Amino acid sequence: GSSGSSGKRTQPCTYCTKEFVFDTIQSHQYQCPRLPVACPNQCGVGTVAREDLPGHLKDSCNTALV
Numbered sequence: 001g002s003s004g005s006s007g008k009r010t011q012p013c014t015y016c017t018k019e020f021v022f023d024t025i026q027s028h029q030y031q032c033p034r035l036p037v038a039c040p041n042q043c044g045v046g047t048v049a050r051e052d053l054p055g056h057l058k059d060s061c062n063t064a065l066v
């Protein structure tokens, strides 16, 4: 940057299997949906993709929700 050629390497996320900037990947890792996340209800499933928690919390999870 700043009218210069530094070179920002990219790190292939193992979750979204996509290519990102090593500078972003650091933070993205959090945004990445695929990334597994522990259930807040500690039902048992253990870990489940961030984009999988929503549906799971629907019925999958032990708790009840309508």
Ligand SMILES: [Zn+2]
Pocket (backbone or CB within 6 Å): 013, 014, 015, 016, 017, 018, 028, 029, 032, 033
């Ligand atoms: Zn990712």
Ligand SMILES: [Zn+2]
Pocket (backbone or CB within 6 Å): 039, 040, 041, 042, 043, 044, 045, 056, 057, 060, 061, 062
């Ligand atoms: Zn659960």
